[PDB]
Design an enzyme around this catalytic site. Structure first.
Site, PDB file in Angstrom:
ATOM      1  N   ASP A   1       0.873  -1.091   0.050  1.00 25.52           N
ATOM      2  CA  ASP A   1      -0.111  -0.093   0.026  1.00 25.52           C
ATOM      3  C   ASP A   1       0.735   1.250   0.097  1.00 25.52           C
ATOM      4  O   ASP A   1       1.665   1.372   0.888  1.00 25.52           O
ATOM      5  CB  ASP A   1      -0.952  -0.084   1.139  1.00 25.52           C
ATOM      6  CG  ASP A   1      -1.816  -1.152   1.281  1.00 25.52           C
ATOM      7  OD1 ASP A   1      -1.884  -2.005   0.355  1.00 25.52           O
ATOM      8  OD2 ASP A   1      -2.305  -1.379   2.384  1.00 25.52           O
TER       9      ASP A   1
ATOM     10  N   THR B   1      -0.906   6.621  -4.723  1.00 27.50           N
ATOM     11  CA  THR B   1       0.141   6.772  -3.780  1.00 27.50           C
ATOM     12  C   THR B   1       1.596   6.407  -4.545  1.00 27.50           C
ATOM     13  O   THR B   1       2.540   6.981  -4.161  1.00 27.50           O
ATOM     14  CB  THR B   1      -0.119   6.199  -2.683  1.00 27.50           C
ATOM     15  OG1 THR B   1      -0.549   4.601  -3.064  1.00 27.50           O
ATOM     16  CG2 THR B   1      -1.287   6.599  -1.892  1.00 27.50           C
TER      17      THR B   1
END
Lengths: 508, 513, 73, 509
Positions: A51, A84
């Site tokens: 992530d 991201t």
């Protein structure tokens, strides 16, 4: 105080943001590699993290380079999805590219405006490869299958990718645009079946109902109210204080029992069987609620009420003096079921419909939570996908065509930004390289010949690194709504061009 | 950069030495650990199957192995070292393969491909033996119990383990006879001789004294209700300043509650498991002894164990204040039996009740909890290895021996794959010969006699057999009565495969602040 | 890749035997030791083995590695 | 002997050989800036070079890979003439690439692989920029005048090039399709001006015995000889040096005179009016040639007596081993004449028609030998320019052309080969940076524009270091001959490719 100067401000621009750019890109693109987040500071443990934001946020940002790209690329993932990595990695590669152009020192306006024009030219060259698969709503369903199926990739899941492959489709398909969750309510519990996820009719809740309050509440009329007590209910008469001294300590503990008995009155006025309040009680009041006749279902949840509100017609409203101001959701049954050694309670009365409730199961929440984010990043691209169905066939087969085509736009078009639109084209093939060695294929023939090859119209045949081979990204489904590959380059090169424009970092 | 390699190497380094310091295993090897800790605290530890969990290690991959140490222990309960001993067997190939021009990804599926083919061959060396067979239960328990704490009380525990499983047995080669199912309770007093298999649900509570029910006709406990009394749930405007008026409050408080406990006995209740919460005081010590005046077994602050098992077995829920009386959500109970053997221990035995076709509650006894835990962890792991044989019906070579059989034969699949990971397989296919020679590690002088033989002892035995590691003498590794179901070993390989494969993806430097 | 091109003929040797085709000395894309036309006397390869496998054993000759303190100077 | 593995030798290869490509590229272009010559170990006296070959010859380098370039430098400088500083840098340009490529995991095998084919891709694009000028004599005249003095540009003394190149093209204009640099007698001789550097039609000798031998003769027979006089050659006319008895050492001189005197006869009896000796002539035979109508020139120039043998039709005497028997040099004109401040012996009526004496006249020899150093490298290109009359558009023009060509080929190749081949044409794009940055002007402007110009493709606008900016190559004289380029395009990538196969270096040093 302090002011950082051109080199160092541009160097500090390259130290933190390229670092955080190196972390997540192991995962990004296809998957030949993943990122692991060592956690020694908050705990002694390990966090497997594909992530970006997790690696962005769990790493505190002291760096005007890292703060930005942790700030930027998060918003990039918060809007476009899987961003991201996007802004961070892509700018990091460009911040690598900004170095030499700043190192060999073209004046920055070139390095600024070269990639500026080139980021467009990147988008442009890849805007050619953008093609709608939204031709049929089942093909768009499949366009929602491959686009979301691409977005679910590189993000660690088990059956959640397969569950939220179609469920990301299902959500945006019946909502018809703007991939989001109002139509599927995610209530995550730890279940026995490890990878399995299933549809939740109405919604379910946790509690153990003992004493006089029956374990089962039948023919459920849900009275939806945010009015509830915890230990006691304070009100006009419910505000009383007996203690000026040490005498009333034993007495003041008596009247707390009445404040438990006083609120039970106003809902009996409403008379509705099921009264859902969001707040806990003790057991001795549960013994008082059980004899009331208006059932107190302890600690109701918000999302499941919005679940009922759409299909049933019920409402959660304000100014609650009466049942009338609250539209009443009609539920079949309310039961205490024993699921594992935890005892559970479930609401019903609807079958799927405008909304839904999704209940995940598993041993830990790390498999559950990344599902809804990988869902969300799909939702973000699926918010893009209905607007623009254009599915550009990726892996770098989309990306390196820009490296190929912008080079064309680099060679003739700009005068001194030729080197810049070349330098910008370099990062466009660069993750294809770092994902090539991850799955063990030659970066070069890939990032060199194939960018020429797949720019010949071989855009179909493309870069999937789970393998080390070239494959069609229409058949392999690595591709997304091309708005996912635009805004990322924008806020990426910009976040690289933000701190590229920076010749001074003034530290107060 | 260099950041990924070093710490990933350190992940392969710091965890390996821990995993290398592991194998003393299977019986009399090495010398005892009286352990001054990293903090200096001095602690004695033996039989490192348990010491794995007990071991306190830092560093990312090193603490991972203690968390990986339960991985074999969590599901199985037999041969807990099997994953930790091979936790470094993969780290064997790790260094080389990273250094071999082979990618951590190519090393990642390498663990898989070696795991995939490994558990495959283990099935061939898994001798399927009857899932419900008293022997394959008893002897699985026995062999374990032989290695577990009590080798004599095994003859008591093994059938009790059998009888506890065979009660809850859901005969299958799949998951059956869970650990949540069998209820293993401890009772001070009696003996391991007097450790009693009890088919019915036995709650272990703190029962007030005696003169209470050992007898029939009880409505079961697990009640959360407080007893409303003046100076409890009821308003008393009697003010307390002077001692006399401070005296007037407790007397109405104490005189009233004794009627409440009569109402509680009126419910038919000889037992109350009282919520560990307090509604005010919940049940006061006035109320609790008044409960003991009615022969009602009552524990204020009851354990969570007898709360869920009474829900699991007797099907019990709290009942309301006894002025409000009850919804009779208390499950069906009949015999409420407190065994006093020399008076030691408070043990609530419900003989007959609602039951979920399951939950044998075995009372584990002894002169002390130490004597009790001699049986308990033994009967548990006896249940477990039986559960493992209920989970997987088979008995394989015990103590890591079959991995050396799996060693040679996975080296054949090193050729059959013919892949880049076939080399990876090859490096690890020879890294499973390490344990038996390494189990001998720590004891003594003139070492080497053990090493290459235990390698060759299966190698010389072709793909068939070698010496037993836990027994000894040239024989079949598989059929010894050192035997474990196929689960234990295929567990271990599956467990170390992943966590050690995470190392391959462990990279750079990232730390949560 | 020294692993993969070795994996190449590895799979090939799991297929073909006594191969006239093996990896590239001549550095081609196809690997055919006949059609790379890398050609070495099977005497030589044999003799090479005999000679190449030789030295490693020879450092074991007697038990004496013993030096006065000069094994090189 | 210490084995240097890949990066040890290879970095050592880069650091020297690329820097060897640097101080020479510091000299690259006429506005390649002057490098003060700081010599290594000897000769603290300092010239200041606009041409890097000096540094390579002046300064020795310990890097063996750099020890290769000076030779490759001298390959160009001797064989090809100009292209000397350039062959060194383009290799370094390709080495700067392999800096990455090696550490970028690309094995030098592959690094050669593209550059194998890529070398022609530029050659072929420079075959495309190869267009025949000089297809006409007036063309050839100005095609020489194009690349004749263009050879002299970076080379420190481009100023007298005005007179020099006119001389240089005329002699090669006289060659008329047949290149002869021995028929051009090269005399670097002090006196007069540097614009007084001269081209004789005929042969000539900087050696003058004096006026005590006949100075001018018509229909003169020149004896071309190593024949000795006081040296006592064969065929005794009277006692040579020896002791055969008590007084035999005394019978030497007077009969050595007669031997010297009949070594007039044998030499004279050719019928010569000139005796040109590459060895000593004793004064009596000398003056007895002066009394015979024979011009006897002592120790006349080795290359001169050789070119006098080539241009005039002369045979060496075999060192008097043909006392009467050697074929004479025959030049109908003898002129003892002052070019510069020195009387020089001019020979016309020589056998060769292309026979010429270029007399380079030093007003100082530092420019004179520099004139001679600038002389022949032109003549090197000139004979090339003679045989292939043609040009290629320099100043980065064909460079960027080849750059945009090979790169777009590196764009249509791009397998393992482009990894070299993109690294290849970038050098073709990187050298245009060098001269313009030598010119002290932004290349990133010009190059990347020159890119665009040659991404449009171009034979004309190219970076003019004269202007310091992009400008026409029409054959403006900064348009280079195809002569040197092909040689450099051949020679340059080699030393790169050469070191590419040998990273392994075993050093006992």
């Amino acid at each position: 105080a302090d002011e950082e100067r051109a080199e160092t401000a541009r160097l500090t621009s390259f130290i933190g943001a390229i670092a955080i750019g190196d972390l997540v890109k192991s995962t990004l693109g296809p998957k030949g590699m993943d990122k692991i987040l060592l956690s020694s500071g908050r705990d002694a443990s390990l966090m497997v993290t594909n992530d970006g934001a997790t690696i962005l946020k769990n790493i505190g940002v002291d760096n005007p380079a890292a703060k930005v790209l942790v700030d930027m690329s998060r918003v990039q993932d918060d809007e476009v999805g899987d961003g991201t990595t996007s802004v961070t990695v892509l700018a990091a590669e460009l911040l690598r590219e900004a170095e030499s152009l700043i190192a060999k020192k073209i004046h920055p306006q070139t390095i600024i405006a070269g990639w500026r024009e080139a980021t467009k030219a990147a988008r442009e060259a890849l805007l050619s490869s953008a093609v709608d698969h939204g031709s049929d709503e089942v093909k768009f369903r499949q366009d929602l299958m491959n686009i979301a199926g691409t977005t679910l990739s590189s993000k660690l899941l088990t059956h959640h990718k397969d569950h939220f492959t179609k469920l990301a489709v299902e959500a945006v398909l019946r909502l018809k645009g703007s991939g989001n969750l109002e139509a599927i309510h995610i209530i995550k519990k730890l279940g026995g079946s490890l990878a399995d996820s299933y549809l939740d009719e109405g919604f379910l809740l946790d509690k153990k109902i003992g004493v006089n309050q029956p374990k089962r509440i039948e023919n459920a009329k849900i009275l939806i109210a945010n009015t509830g007590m915890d230990t006691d209910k304070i009100k006009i008469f419910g505000s009383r204080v007996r203690v000026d001294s040490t005498a009333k300590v034993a007495e003041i503990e008596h009247a707390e029992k009445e404040k438990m008995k006083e609120k039970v009155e106003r809902i009996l006025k409403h008379g509705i069987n099921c009264f859902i309040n969001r707040q806990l009680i003790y057991n001795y009041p549960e013994q008082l609620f059980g004899a009331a006749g208006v059932m107190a279902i302890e600690h109701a949840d918000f999302a499941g009420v919005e679940r009922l509100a759409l299909v049933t017609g019920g409402e959660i409203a304000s100014t609650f003096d009466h049942p009338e101001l609250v539209k009443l959701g009609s539920c079949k049954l309310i039961e205490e079921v024993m699921i594992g050694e935890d005892k559970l309670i479930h609401f019903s009365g609807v079958a799927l419909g405008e909304a839904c409730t999704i209940v995940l199961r598993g041993a830990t929440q790390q498999i559950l939570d990344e599902a809804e984010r990988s869902l969300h990043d799909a939702l973000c691209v699926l918010a893009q996908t209905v607007k623009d169905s254009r599915t550009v066939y990726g892996g770098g087969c989309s990306e390196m065509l820009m490296a190929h085509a912008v080079t064309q736009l680099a060679n003739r078009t700009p005068g001194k930004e030729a080197v810049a639109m070349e330098s910008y084209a370099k990062a466009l093939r660069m993750l294809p390289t770092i994902i090539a060695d991850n799955a063990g294929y030659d970066s070069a023939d890939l990032v060199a010949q194939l960018r020429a090859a797949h720019s010949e119209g071989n855009t179909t045949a493309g870069l999937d690194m789970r393998e080390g081979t070239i494959g069609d990204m229409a058949i392999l489904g690595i591709t997304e709504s091309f708005q996912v590959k635009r805004q990322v380059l924008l806020s990426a090169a910009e976040a690289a061009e933000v701190i590229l424009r920076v010749d001074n970092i003034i530290k107060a | 950069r260099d950041k990924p390699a070093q710490i990933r190497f350190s992940n392969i380094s710091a965890a390996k030495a821990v995993a290398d310091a592991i194998r003393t295993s299977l019986g009399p090897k090495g010398m005892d650990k009286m352990i001054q800790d990293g903090k200096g605290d001095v602690t004695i530890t033996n039989d490192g199957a348990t010491i794995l969990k007990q071991m306190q290690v830092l560093h990312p991959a090193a603490r991972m192995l203690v968390e990986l140490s339960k991985a074999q222990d969590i599901e199985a309960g037999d041969g807990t070292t099997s994953v930790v001993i091979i936790a470094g067997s993969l780290l064997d190939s790790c260094t080389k393969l990273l250094q071999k021009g082979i990618h951590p990804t190519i090393i990642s599926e390498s663990f898989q491909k070696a795991l995939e083919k490994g558990i495959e061959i283990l099935t061939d060396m898994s001798r399927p033996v009857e899932l419900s067979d008293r022997e394959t239960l008893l002897n699985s328990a026995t062999t374990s119990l032989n290695s577990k704490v009590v080798s004599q009380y095994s003859s008591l525990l093994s059938p009790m383990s059998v009888n506890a499983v065979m009660k809850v047995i859901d005969p299958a080669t799949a998951t059956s006879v869970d650990l949540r199912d069998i209820k293993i309770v401890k009772k001070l007093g009696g003996t391991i001789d007097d450790c009693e298999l009890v088919e019915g649900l036995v709650l272990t509570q703190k029962v007030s004294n005696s003169g209470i029910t050992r007898v029939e006709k009880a409505k079961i406990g697990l009640i959360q209700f407080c007893l409303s009394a003046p100076k409890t749930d009821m308003d008393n405007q009697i003010v307390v300043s002077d001692y006399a008026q401070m005296d007037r409050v407790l007397r109405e408080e104490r005189a009233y509650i004794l009627n409440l406990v009569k109402q509680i006995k009126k419910t038919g209740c000889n037992v109350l498991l009282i919520q560990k919460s307090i509604l005010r005081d919940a049940l006061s010590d006035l109320a609790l002894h008044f409960l003991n005046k009615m022969k009602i077994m009552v524990i204020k602050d009851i354990e969570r164990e007898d709360i869920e098992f009474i829900c699991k077995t007797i099907g019990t829920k709290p009942v309301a204040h006894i002025d409000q009386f009850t919804a009779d959500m208390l499950g069906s109970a009949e015999l409420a039996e407190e065994v006093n053997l020399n008076g030691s221990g408070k043990l609530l035995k419900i003989t007959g009740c609602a039951s979920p076709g399951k939950t044998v509650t075995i009372v584990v006894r002894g002169s002390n909890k130490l004597v009790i835990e001699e049986a308990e962890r033994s009967i548990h792991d006896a249940l477990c290895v039986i559960r493992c044989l209920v989970k997987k019906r088979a008995l394989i070579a015990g103590g890591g021996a079959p991995e050396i059989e799996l060693a040679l034969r996975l080296t054949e699949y090193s050729r059959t794959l013919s892949g880049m990971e076939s080399y990876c397989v090859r490096a690890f296919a020879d890294a499973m010969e390490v344990i038996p020679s390494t189990l001998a590690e720590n004891a003594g002088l003139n070492p080497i006699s053990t090493v290459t033989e235990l390698r060759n002892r299966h190698a010389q035995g072709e793909k068939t057999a070698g010496i037993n590691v836990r027994k000894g003498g040239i024989s079949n590794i598989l059929e010894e009565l050192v035997v474990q179901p196929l689960l234990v070993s295929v567990s271990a390989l599956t467990l170390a495969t992943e966590t050690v494969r995470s190392i391959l993806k462990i990279d750079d430097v990232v730390n949560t602040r | 890749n020294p692993i993969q091109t070795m994996t190449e003929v590895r799979a090939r040797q799991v297929k073909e035997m006594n191969p006239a085709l093996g990896i590239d000395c001549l550095h081609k894309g196809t690997n055919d030791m006949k059609q790379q036309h890398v050609i070495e006397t099977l005497i030589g390869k044999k003799q090479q083995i005999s000679l190449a496998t030789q030295m490693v054993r020879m450092i074991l000759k007697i038990d004496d590695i013993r030096k006065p303190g000069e094994s090189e100077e």
